[PDB]
Amino acid sequence: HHHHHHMVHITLDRNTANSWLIISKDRRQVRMGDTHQNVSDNKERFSNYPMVLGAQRFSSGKMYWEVDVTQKEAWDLGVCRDSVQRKGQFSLSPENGFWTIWLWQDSYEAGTSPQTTLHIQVPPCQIGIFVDYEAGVVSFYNITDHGSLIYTFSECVFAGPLRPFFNVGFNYSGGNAAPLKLCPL
Numbered sequence: 718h719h720h721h722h723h724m725v726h727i728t729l730d731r732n733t734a735n736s737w738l739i740i741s742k743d744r745r746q747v748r749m750g751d752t753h754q755n756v757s758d759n760k761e762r763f764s765n766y767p768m769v770l771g772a773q774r775f776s777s778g779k780m781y782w783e784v785d786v787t788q789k790e791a792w793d794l795g796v797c798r799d800s801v802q803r804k805g806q807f808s809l810s811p812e813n814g815f816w817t818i819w820l821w822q823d824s825y826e827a828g829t830s831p832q833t834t835l836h837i838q839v840p841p842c843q844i845g846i847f848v849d850y851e852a853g854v855v856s857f858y859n860i861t862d863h864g865s866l867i868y869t870f871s872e873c874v875f876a877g878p879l880r881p882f883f884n885v886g887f888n889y890s891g892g893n894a895a896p897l898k899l900c901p902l
């Protein structure tokens with residue numbers, strides 16, 4: 718890929734975060750806490766899962782950012798509609814307004830319905846996410862493997878503004894406490 722030059726400065730939106738998440742002062746890192754984080758509930762917060770949105774909203778153009786996933790056992794990354802459901806149980810699918818990939822139990826999968834197996838030779842420590850609003854494209858790149866393509870969603874029906882989407886995953890095992898981190902330009 719040569720997509721680096723549509724780089725956008727993403728920050729996390731505290732108000733959308735699950736109440737157990739801890740967002741750094743610079744709003745560039747998020748991790749699971751060991752308890753509820755002493756914040757009020759609001760209609761924006763994801764209730765059931767350790768999810769948060771980016772502050773940025775996109776309705777046009779080309780956007781690129783990178784996320785560090787070092788030493789995590791489980792995570793979800795991509796983009797979603799601003800209008801996605803926040804409360805209760807739901808699946809990550811384009812029909813529900815999500816364009817995502819994940820790591821779960823040593824397998825990488827794209828969030829189609831049903832989910833699609835990914836073929837990654839070099840487990841990634843850093844993921845690049847590229848959105849072309851007009852083209853209807855969301856692509857994922859393996860930064861650890863010289864930017865090799867992971868997966869492309871095409872003919873996407875965004876149907877409104879998009880937000881960067883993050884899930885740090887649960888930490889039942891004790892091996893998934895590490896943060897997601899937005900990487901510098």
Ligand SMILES: CC(=O)N1C[C@H]2CC[C@@H]1c1ccccc12
Pocket residue numbers: 735737764765766767
């Ligand atoms: C009581 C309850 O249902 N939970 C507590 C904890 C672990 C599972 C679930 C949950 C969802 C989101 C964030 C934190 C949690």
